[PDB]
DNA sequence: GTACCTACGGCTTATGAT
DNA sequence: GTACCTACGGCTTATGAT
DNA sequence: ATCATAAGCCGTAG
DNA sequence: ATCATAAGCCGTAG
């Protein structure tokens, strides 16, 4: 219990020392190698811990070391280690054991959470080292923004538009909006094919008022199918179709694609035209077609090349930026050096903790383990 | 800096873990019937090059290779999965042919990973056939440095042949094995009739199959499971009474135990029940099992009919156990209870797609080879002017430029179909006698040797040209009509059935 | 059948085990200073292709590979040996550059074999340089399917640089590390004077070296060990007193501990001795070690000189420990106590042999290449008759026969040394202008391309021919006189010394 | 003690059951899987056992299970398991632990060895399977004789000697004697080089009476050096020298060889000429030169080829014999199947046990562990 | 996912006996 | 070189309560 | 005599 | 108060 695992600090007064909970060997080794000997305490853990609701028995106990060392298990008398911090791996198993620990503490001692004593650490996730330039990155969005900054470190575009040398915050915001739109298209790709979505970037606009003339609809769908057939380098075909479902017209185009063995149609509806996704697509397409970015000249920072596509230029710039960088990803607490672990996780001036709240009394724990909530909750569509 | 965070984050964490597990670990797919662990193991064994007709190899190499390149999630589960496949009494058709202590029915675990020797079997190559022909997609590894196939271009519906049994955070599935010949017959019948009924499919396949024979009693359960997806079925062991020709005494012989039954635990429980007086008519217990078949002998107490005792055993002893049929798998990454017809249709569609992609790849390869051979033969036609042009030109690049810049005569001995002899990306400004070369063609000409100037290389080139013409014609024909494609599928399935045919093991006695 | 056997068989069994162990496990060799385990590990790392300028690799891959192909004797000892090499505080020059938790001086063991990443260092390639040039012999594995090098063609006497410490059934050895620069200087001095005395060698190399500095007191022990092979030497830690500019109090600072000392055990023993009243003048104990250097603080009790307490500690505390110098190694597979001069002489002889064999191999390779290039140039001289001969002959074998059967003209533009331009096995019936071909030469001619007919390939061939002539001349010259060989050895050793020079760490204070 | 490891048989009467001692897991698993349940007992072992003399303490005990289960540790009262058998791996570690067990029993209970109860098993060593033909081989000499038989399965030599078709027991005995002589030469190779030893096969005889004429000695040494230079395809040289150390002649040739950098001489002495090794060499050389085996024709069994060397013909025959065989070597008791283990090690009709003796009372155990015997015993030169 | 046993020599350190 | 802990669902088997 | 509570097993994972 | 006997540790191996 008290010996073997718990390695307390010199100070015996609570509310001054901190307690940590990690995986036993791989983490505790470096943790004890790098910890301080004044207000530091580490309690290792072996594997996982049983749930409270799935098997509720006051006599059921396997470790009991956490409770035995924190309190007497009843708490107002002894409140040793007023501050606790949970360090955990960044994987799904770490998140799972974190959830188990959180619900365990919540269902055992509500007061220690109400009085604001539980804390969660934020371990780093990426280590980017561009020679002398080093960087510690923790989140996917932060990594993406850092990559975008490295790619946009002082470029200067030269098109035949109104601006001879277009560069700066306008171009950066345009690239950010383009990336957001590409992410939205990648998310919606589950419904419709990607070829038409990518081609709508350069295809002209469309309005519900265009349902008057059949010639305009035919011209638009013919240009669309022709450009699709031109851009198609793989084994696929594209056909057009004009449909009228109305009293008189309600012109509705239908795009016919021929993959390996099965044809598939994709009509166009008023709801699809009115949808905010298609509206944003049309707005960005107009903004990009109003650029006249055919003949372009952008350099970062000693070489430039004229291309015929803004996305091709962006890919070339990203490649030029990612030529000479190095990235190491730490996939475990028992992977870095003790000094790095200290400085990046438990430095009272460099760490980034997290506070838990007691906002509302809800039945999340009740819906946790019934198999009914387990069947009904996966509605992530 | 300590930003305030809501307690609601607990829901975002558990949902992510549940989704990731359900998608990637437990539930298999309808197109392969294989877990990602089995997938990575088979892919590693294929890349390493451990065929069936080769020498054995240590397990440590394969385990370390899989851990290092594809599956960085320990070694214990990997070794247990490997040992599970090699056990004959655990699968209807084994996949990993091994050699060494692999455990037995007695529950004894296998030896360490530093003693066994494993390799692929003849049936294993039927799973990953035609892999490098661009038949499936490639998925990146954890760090984005390698490629992993998404689905296996299989030829046998392993999901219905062997099945699996896993449990997820939300769902749980379990499918009994079956016989290969009846599955092939049902596939052929469905190819014949797309609107076949459940009775027509049930008529060809009476019931499931097990590695060890057994006795099936309930017929309503298997039908309800085949129609909906859930049902119950009972398993009964094979036993009989024995009376000597003389006075002697009655004796029970056990020839086989039900599926997933420990023999030592069963004998211990029987001895305990006999000691507890709960069962009557039992006096002693012996064992006569050997390397010729399992044999258990139970001595019947004097003055006992034994049939009532046997019925009491069947009621209490594990010799009669039910089974929780539950068919749940993935169709587009979503758990969906699916019946037999849907699985067969998905298998047929996957086979069609694989065959079509392989045909396209082979057609493109043959087109490129024939287009290169055409220019090679043209260069073989006129040789002496090329000799002088090479002898005069100091720079090989200048020689290539001079060759490209000048037309050619297209001798009479040099001069097929009207089309389909040229690549798609080829521009109409070449091959309009009249003929022009290309930088690639010029480099191919520069890459020739002196051995290609004999009285046999010309005939070999002409034969290869005619063969490529015939092959591309046949490929265009099979791409034209789907009836030829269906005929090829039927012939391949009939050949597979003829290769790996076998006999029924279990027995179905309706009530 | 139970034949009677004598009890004397006990002696035949133990003797075999003792001999096998002593020959193969514990005692290293004077030519490498490496154990067979280290040998197999380095050979596996070299065959796999894990250089210093490449990406890291998992340890499981290397461990499983070594277990499977070369060292089938477990994994625990192999992993411990691998971790031993990566520790900076355990060797003067590390060999395995790794990344991860490798333990520390606190006695904490390293992590599992599924977390670390290791690769070779720049100094490692200096050990196994010139391996594929047939410089050493190959030894079969346990089943006779692979080849293992017997000795490593090294350039640095690792035995004297790092040393080892093993114990056998009969003997036990232990050698302290040393400095590289002084070893190179001693080798150069011995190359200068073969009859150098022990004092001349001792003058260049004062004493051993350690990864952490220390204090050496006894000078008689190291001299007796260098002269005979056995001796004792004391190691003293570095400490000092501290008194504040004000009244303050005395304080002891510990900058370094002796070699092979556990810090936690030492602190625990000091605390125990203070509690047991056995030591006086000690009040408390603290620690100030960080990532900038180890620092231990001991608070001196009030009213104490502290020097008597420090002397009592040096007498009792592990801060002063002796060392059992014992130099025993193998010379022809037999344990023999050998001095410094014998080791240096064996190193020089091994280097001479390696250089000679490499020179012979390179000379043979250059001879073969030049002999092929001669025939290639001859074929380049006359081309048109070969063209007609190839055009007429239907069979390539018949064309080769016709080429061999006919002499050649040896054009003026085609026409070195009087000899040394032909292989040894070449018969005098070829190359007697006059010239004849060979079936191998004819096949080489048949293996020509069209790119070799430009205004630059001829000049390239002539340049390569002249270069090969110069190279074979230089090789014959260096094989002629041993003085050039000794000059090359000296230049290479000076270059190696210039590459990996460093500064002394320890300190020697004579009494 | 009694549970956990010991798995006794049904019979409780001693002198009918047998006890075995092997490595615990890897061996005991298959052993229990293949053992009988009538008179079979297995006691596993974990690692090694301390020595009796190196550390003698009656209180010292770690396992004590062997003694506790065999007797009460004193023995005449209880004599359970009158028969014991020791199965052990075929490696040096197995032999070592076997020696430890033997000396342990000898120094603990002399009566159990005097009454003839200790037995040692002889596990197989090689498994040769030539398709349908299988074979179990236990010893290196047996393996060698089996290989020689497979190579000599019905060959028939056709030389120009007195026998048109020479074959059979004479040729087999000649091959056996040649192999024995080659083994003797390989053993003596540590002293003298191998080239001269191999060339003495075809070189003419020599007699101490040849020390009269210098011309004969010169002719012989010249022929020797010439043939050595002819056969030398590597980078070595050979020189001759005639020496006279006597009152008048005592002719003594000296052979000078030039390796990489150092020349080495090898004079010929009366003792070397008289040695039985050189005598056997001369006898075999005469026997082989009296064969006239230059033009030969031997077939096994459908192909023949004339060669110029009997050893080359032997190598060709060995290659032809070893073309299509398969060999598996079992390097551990936990490597084969349980049925094979049973049938080949502990079958009361197929096994091959071994009996220990109490011949003499000697101080081998005394000289075992003193380090003086350990230093003086390695005299295997 | 993890705690205690052995050989083998040379060295030491501690503790009861002459 | 080796023995006992957890999640996760669906199934069963056994045992005390209405 | 008939319902509520305590277990064991199946396969990946630690 | 001064000599003979019992341990622990170092690294490969099982």
DSSP character string of A97-111: HHHHHHHHHHHH-HH
Tokens (6 digits) for B499:
């290769």
Kindly name the residue from A11, A25, A91, A295 that is annotated as catalytic.
A91
Residue C316 CA distance to nucleotide E16 C1' (Å): 21
| 3-class secondary-structure state, position B92 | coil
Residues 6 or more apart whose CB falls under 8 angstroms from that of C450 comprise B390, B445, B446, B447, B448
Closest CA to A124 of A356, A354, A352: A352
C9-CA/H5-C1' distance, Å: 34
As a whole number of Å, the CA-based R_g of chain C is 32
**What is the DSSP annotation of B420-483?**
SSS-SS--TTS--------HHHHHHHHT-BGGG-STTHHHHHHHHHHHHHHHHHHHHHHHH-HH
Angle, helices B482-499/B457-480, rounded to nearest 10 degrees: 100
CA distance A190 to A185: 9
CB A102 within 8 Å of CB A360: no
What span, in angstroms and rounded, lies between the C-alpha atoms of C268 and C252? 18
- All residues of chain B having their beta carbon less than 8 Å from the beta carbon of residue D26 are 111-112, 115
Known catalytic residues of D are 23, 89, 91, 93
Half-sphere exposure of C286 (CA within 13 A, CB side): 11
Nearest to B369 by CA among B415, B423, B410: B423
Interface test mutation site (partner C, options D95, D233, D237, D363, max chain C beta carbons within 10 A):
D95
Q: CA–CA separation, B477 vs B417, rounded Å?
A: 14
Walk across the sheet containing C230-232 and list its strands. C165-167, C172-174, C324-326, C230-232
Is-catalytic flag, B93? no
As given in the structure block, the two tokens for residue B196 are 């076949």
CB count in 10 Å sphere of residue C358: 16
DSSP A313: H
Determine which helix (DSSP H) or strand (DSSP E) holds B317, and give its type and residue range. none
Experimental resolution (Å): 4.6
User: Roughly what angle, to the nearest 10 degrees, separates helices B340-381 and B439-446?
Assistant: 70
CB-based burial of residue A317 (10 Å sphere; 0-12 exposed, 13-18 middle, 19+ buried)? buried
Q: Given B394, B445, B453, which is nearest C391 (Cβ)?
A: B453
- Bridge partners of A83? A18
Local structure of residue C451 (DSSP, 8 states): G
- The distance from CA A81 to its chain's CA centroid, rounded to whole angstroms, is 35
Q: How many residues does chain A have?
A: 381
As a whole number of angstroms, the longest Cα–Cα distance in chain A is 88
Nearest Cα residue to B38 out of B154, B170, B140: B154
Cross-sheet strand order for the sheet of C57-58: C57-58, C117-120, C96-99
* Chains C and D touch, using 3 or more CB pairs below 8 Å: yes
Q: CA triplet D158, D159, D164: central angle to 5 degrees?
A: 60
Task: Give the E-state strand segments of B13-134 in sequence order.
Answer: 57-58, 96-99, 117-120
| C-beta of residue C174 within 8 angstroms of C-beta of residue C326 | yes
Joined together, the tokens standing for residue B466 give 């005619």
Report the candidate in B21, B64, B22, B23 with the shortest Cα–Cα distance to residue B41.
B64
Cα–Cα distance list, C156 to C28, C30, C108, C134, D71 (Å): 15, 12, 32, 19, 60
Give the position of tokens 């960044």.
Answer: A90
- How many other CB atoms are found less than 10 A from the CB of residue A241? 14
> Under 8 Å CB-to-CB from B415, ≥6 apart: which residues?
B433
Beginning with the edge strand found earlier in the chain, give each strand of the sheet holding C250-256 in spatial order: C238-243, C250-256, C296-300, C282-287
Q: Nearest 5 degrees, angle CA D343-CA D346-CA D350?
A: 60
Q: Which residues contact D94 (CB under 8 A, 6 or more apart)?
A: D88
**How long, in residues, is chain C?**
511
Radius of gyration of chain A from Cα atoms?
Answer: 30
What is the strand order of the sheet B165-167 is part of? B165-167, B172-174, B324-326, B230-232
State which H helix or E strand residue B282 sits in. strand B282-287
Give Cβ neighbours of residue D190 (< 8 Å, ≥ 6 apart).
Answer: none
CB contact under 8 A, B352 and A261: yes
- Total number of domains in chain C: 1
Separation CA A210–CA A204 (nearest Å): 12
Would you say C135 and C351 are in contact if contact means Cβ atoms under 8 Å apart? no
Measured CA to CA, the distance from residue C417 to residue C469 in angstroms comes to: 8
Q: Please count the helices (runs of H) and the strands (runs of E) in chain B.
A: 16, 19
The burial class, CB within 10 Å (0-12 / 13-18 / 19+), for C474 is middle
Query: C329-330 and C235-236: which strand pairing?
Result: unpaired
Rg (CA), chain D: 30
Question: Å from B138 (CA) to F8 (C1')?
Answer: 30
Strand H–CB C269 distance below 7 A = no
Q: Which nucleotide is nearest to B37 (CA to C1')?
A: G12
Chain C residues with CB under 8 Å of B75 CB are 60, 114
Nearest C-alpha neighbor of B254 from the set B240, B268, B267, B264: B240
Helix (H) or strand (E) holding B167: strand B165-167
Copy the structure tokens of residue C365.
């390779």
Candidates B20, B7, B11, B77; CA nearest to A92 is: B20
Euclidean distance between CA atoms A254 and A266, whole angstroms: 6
- What residues are paired with A255 via a beta bridge? A240, A266
Is nucleic acid strand G under 7 Å from A59's C-beta? no
Q: Is the dihedral of CA D103, D104, D105, D111 positive or negative?
A: positive
- The dihedral through the CA atoms of A296, A299, A305, A310 has a sign that is negative
Q: What is the DSSP code string of A271-293?
A: HHHHSHHHHHHHHHHHHHHTT--
Taking alpha carbons only, the member of D207, D369, D199, D195 closest to residue D279 is: D207
Q: What whole-number distance in Å separates Cα of residue B449 and Cα of residue C453? A: 12
- Bases of chain H below 7 A from a protein C-beta are 6-7, 10-14
Cα distance between residue C488 and residue B397, in whole Å: 44
Instruction: Closest CB to B100: pick one of D25, D37, D335.
Output: D335
**DSSP three-state, residue B2:** coil
Q: Do D260 and C1 touch (CB under 8 A)?
A: no
- DSSP assignment of D190-248: TTS-HHHHHHTTTS----GGGGS-HHHHHHHHHHHHHHHHHH--SS-EEEEEEEE-SSS
Tokens of C151: 């000795």
Tokens at B469, concatenated = 């013409």
Given a contact cutoff of 8 angstroms between Cβ atoms, the answer to whether D18 and D85 are in contact is yes
Rounded to whole angstroms, the Cα distance separating C356 from C348 reads 12
Residue C54 near chain B (CB below 8 Å):
no
Burial string for B218-230 (b: 16+ CB within 10 Å, else e) reads beebbebbbeebe
CA distance A104 to B64: 37
Q: If you count DSSP H runs as helices and E runs as strands, how many of each does chain A have, helices first? A: 14, 12
Contact C67, B114 (CB under 8 A): yes
Residue B451 class from Cβ within 10 Å (0-12 exposed, 13-18 middle, 19+ buried)? Answer: middle
Q: How far apart are CA B109 and CA B87, in angstroms?
A: 11
3-state secondary structure at position D353: coil
Are residues C3 and D93, on separate chains, in Cβ contact within 8 Å? no
Tokens 């059979």 — which residue?
D168
d(CA B39, CA B153): 12
- Chains with 3 or more CB pairs under 8 A to chain A: B, C
Residue given tokens 């000479």 in the structure block:
A324
DSSP D108-172: H-HHHHHTT-EEE-----EEEEETTEEEEE-SHHHHHHHHHHHHTSS-EE--SSS-SSB-SHHHH
Tokens of B129: 């056939």
Residue B181 DSSP SS3: helix
Exposed, middle or buried by CB within 10 Å (0-12, 13-18, 19+), for A19? buried
What domains are there in chain D, each with its CATH number? Answer: 1-121+338-374 (no CATH), 124-182+276-337 (3.30.300.370), 183-274 (3.10.20.690)
Residue B168 in contact with residue B158, Cβ under 8 Å?
A: no
> Between C108, C287, C291, which is nearest A29 by CB?
C108
Identify whether the C-beta of residue B411 lies closer than 8 Å to the C-beta of residue B384.
Answer: no
d(CA B115, nearest CA chain D) in Å: 7
Do residues C298 and C282 touch, judged by C-beta distance below 8 A? Answer: yes
Which positions in strand E are less than 7 Å from the protein's CB atoms? Answer: 1-2, 5-14
Helix, strand or coil, per DSSP, at residue C338: coil
Closest C1' nucleotide to D369's CA: E8
d(CA B59, CA D185): 42
Query: Which chain A residues are Cβ-neighbours of B6 within 8 angstroms?
Result: 357, 359
What six digits make up the tokens of A143?
A: 């990594």
Q: Report the sign of the C-alpha dihedral through residues C65, C71, C75, C77, in that order.
A: negative
* Solved with: cryo-EM
Report CA-CA distances (Å) from B34 to A110, B85, B161, B164, B329: 45, 12, 11, 8, 11
Largest CA distance in chain B: 114
Long-range contacts of D275-279 (CB under 8 A, 24+ apart): D277/D184, D277/D188
Expressed as residue numbers, the domain containing C123 is 1-511
Q: Contacts by B260-268 with C-beta closer than 8 Å and gap 24+?
A: B261/B318, B261/B321, B262/B105, B262/B106, B262/B107, B263/B105, B263/B106, B263/B107, B263/B294, B264/B106, B264/B107, B265/B107, B266/B317, B266/B318, B267/B296
Pair B13, A98: CB distance under 8 Å: yes
Tokens of D81: 């398991």
A298 within 8 A of A317, measured Cβ to Cβ: yes
**SS3 at position B62:** helix
Residues of B with CB under 8 A from a CB of A: 1-8, 10-11, 13-22, 143, 169-170, 352-353, 356-357, 360, 482
CA of C273 to C1' of E13 (A): 14
Question: Sign (positive/negative) of CA torsion C29, C31, C33, C35?
Answer: negative
Distance CA B391, CA C452 (A): 10
Helices C340-381 and C180-192, packing angle to 10 deg: 80
CA distance D9 to D32: 11
Distance between the alpha carbon (CA) of C336 and the C1' atom of F8, Å? 65
Pairing of strands D133-137, D126-130: antiparallel
C-alpha–C-alpha distance, residues B291 and B311, integer Å: 30
| Sheet architecture: strand order including D326-329 | D133-137, D126-130, D326-329
The reply to whether A93 Cβ lies less than 7 angstroms from strand G is yes
> By C-alpha distance, which of A155, A254, A251 is closest to A208?
A251
D359 vs C6, C8, D356, CA distance in Å? 7, 9, 9
Instruction: Read off φ and ψ for residue A5, nearest 5 degrees.
Output: -115, -50
Helix (H, G, I), strand (E, B) or coil at C250: strand
Quick one: residue A269, left, alpha or beta (phi over 0 = left, psi -120 to 50 = alpha)?
beta
Which residues in chain C have their CB less than 8 angstroms from residue B72's CB?
A: 114
> C165 to each of B482, C26, C31, C177, how far by Cα in Å?
76, 9, 16, 11
CB C379 within 8 A of CB C269: no
**Tokens (6 digits) for D82:** 């009158």
Q: Is D187 exposed, middle or buried (0-12, 13-18, 19+ CB in 10 A)?
A: exposed
Cβ atoms of D211 and D268 within 8 Å: the answer is: no
Give the orientation angle of helix D169-188 with respect to helix D310-322, to 10 degrees. 100
Tokens matching residue D196? 């001269």
| Contact state of C6 with D359 under an 8 Å Cβ cutoff | yes
Which of the 8 DSSP states describes residue A209? G
A91 annotated ligand binder = yes
The neighbour count for residue B279, using CB atoms within 10 Å, is 15
DSSP D348: T
DSSP run (H or E) holding C166: strand C165-167
CA distance B132 to B361: 10
């Amino acid at each position: 219990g008290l010996p073997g695992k718990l390695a307390d600090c010199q100070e015996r007064d609570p509310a001054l020392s901190e307690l940590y909970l990690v995986e036993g060997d791989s983490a505790g080794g470096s943790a004890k190698q790098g910890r301080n000997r004044k207000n530091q305490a580490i309690l290792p853990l072996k594997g996982k811990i049983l749930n409270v609701e799935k098997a509720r028995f006051d006599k059921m106990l396997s470790s009991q070391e956490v409770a035995t060392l924190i309190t007497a298990l009843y708490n107002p008398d002894k409140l040793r280690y007023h501050s606790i911090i949970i360090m955990t791996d960044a994987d799904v198993d770490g998140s799972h054991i974190r959830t188990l620990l959180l619900t365990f503490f919540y269902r055992q001692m509500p007061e220690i959470v109400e009085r604001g004593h539980v804390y969660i650490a934020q371990p780093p996730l990426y280590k980017v080292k561009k020679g002398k330039q080093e960087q510690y990155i923790k989140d996917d969005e932060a990594m993406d923004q850092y990559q975008i900054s490295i790619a946009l470190d002082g470029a200067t575009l030269h098109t035949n538009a109104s601006a001879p040398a277009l560069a700066g915050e306008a171009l950066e915001k345009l690239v950010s909006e383009y990336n957001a739109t590409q992410k939205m298209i990648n998310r919606m790709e589950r419904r419709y094919p990607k070829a038409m979505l990518k081609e709508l970037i350069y295809q002209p606009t469309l309005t519900e008022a265009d349902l008057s003339d059949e010639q305009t609809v035919t011209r638009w769908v013919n240009a669309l199918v022709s450009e699709l057939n031109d851009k198609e380098q793989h084994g696929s075909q594209w056909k057009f179709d004009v449909h009228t479902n109305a009293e008189q017209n309600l012109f509705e185009p239908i795009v016919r694609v021929r993959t390996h063995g099965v044809d598939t149609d994709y009509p166009l509806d008023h709801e699809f035209i009115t949808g905010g996704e298609y509206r944003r697509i049309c707005t960005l397409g107009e903004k990009l077609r109003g650029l006249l970015e055919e003949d372009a000249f952008i350099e970062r920072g000693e070489r430039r090349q004229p291309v015929a596509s803004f996305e091709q230029a962006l890919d070339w710039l990203v490649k030029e930026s990612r030529r000479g960088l190095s990235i190491q990803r730490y996939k475990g607490l028992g992977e870095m050096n003790p000094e790095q672990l200290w400085e990046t996780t438990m430095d009272p001036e460099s760490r980034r903790m997290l506070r838990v709240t007691v906002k509302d009394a809800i039945a999340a724990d009740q819906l946790f383990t019934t198999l009914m909530g387990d069947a009904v909750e996966p509605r992530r569509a | 800096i300590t930003p305030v965070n809501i307690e609601e984050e607990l829901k975002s964490s558990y949902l992510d873990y549940a989704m990731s597990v359900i998608v990637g670990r437990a539930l298999p797919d309808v197109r392969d019937g294989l877990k990602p662990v089995h997938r990575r193991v088979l892919y590693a064994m294929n890349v390493l090059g451990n065929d069936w007709n080769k020498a054995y190899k240590k397990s440590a190499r394969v385990v370390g290779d899989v851990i290092g390149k594809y599956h960085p999630h320990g070694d214990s589960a990997v070794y247990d999965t490997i040992v599970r496949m090699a056990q004959p009494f655990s699968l209807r058709y084994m996949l990993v042919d091994g050699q060494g202590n692999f455990g037995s029915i007695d529950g004894d675990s296998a030896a360490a990973m530093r003693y066994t020797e494993i390799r692929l079997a003849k049936i294993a190559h039927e799973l990953m056939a035609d892999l490098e022909k661009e038949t499936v997609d490639f998925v990146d590894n954890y760090d984005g440095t390698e490629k992993i196939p998404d689905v296996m271009p299989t030829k046998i519906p392993n999901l219905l042949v062997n099945g699996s049994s896993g449990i997820a955070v939300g769902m749980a599935t379990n499918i009994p094995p079956h016989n290969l010949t009846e599955v092939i017959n049902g596939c052929l019948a469905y190819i014949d009739d797309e609107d076949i009924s459940i009775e027509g499919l049930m008529e060809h396949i009476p019931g499931p199959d097990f590695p060890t024979a057994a006795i099936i009693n309930g017929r309503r359960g298997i039908e309800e499971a085949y129609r909906t997806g859930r049902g119950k079925v009972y398993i009964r062991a094979r036993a009989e009474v024995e009376v000597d020709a003389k006075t002697g005494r009655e004796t029970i012989i056990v020839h086989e135990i039900p599926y997933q039954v420990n023999k030592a635990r069963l004998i211990e429980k029987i001895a305990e029940l006999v000691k507890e007086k709960r069962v009557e008519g039992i006096s002693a217990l012996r064992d006569e099992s050997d390397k010729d078949g399992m044999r258990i002998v139970i001595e019947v107490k004097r003055d006992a009919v034994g049939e009532v005792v046997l019925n009491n055993l069947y009621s209490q002893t594990q010799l009669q156990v039910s089974f929780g049929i539950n068919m749940v798998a993935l169709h587009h990454g979503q758990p969906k209870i699916m019946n037999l017809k849907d699985i067969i249709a998905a298998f047929v569609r996957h086979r069609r797609e694989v065959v079509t992609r392989r045909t396209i790849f082979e057609l493109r390869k043959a087109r490129d080879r024939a287009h290169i051979l055409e220019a090679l033969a043209v260069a073989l036609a006129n040789i002496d002017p090329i000799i002088e042009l090479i002898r005069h030109a100091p720079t090989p690049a200048e020689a290539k430029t001079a060759l490209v810049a000048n037309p050619w005569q297209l001798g009479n001995v040099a001069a097929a179909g009207d089309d389909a002899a040229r690549p798609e990306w080829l521009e109409p400004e070449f091959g309009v006698g009249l003929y022009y070369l290309t930088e690639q063609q010029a480099q191919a000409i520069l890459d020739l040797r002196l051995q290609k100037l004999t009285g046999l290389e010309h005939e070999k080139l002409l034969d290869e040209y005619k063969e490529l013409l015939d092959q591309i014609a046949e490929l265009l024909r099979i791409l034209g009509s789907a009836d030829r494609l269906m005929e090829v599928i039927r012939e391949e399935l009939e050949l597979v059935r003829e290769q790996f045919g076998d006999k029924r093991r279990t027995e179905i006695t309706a009530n």
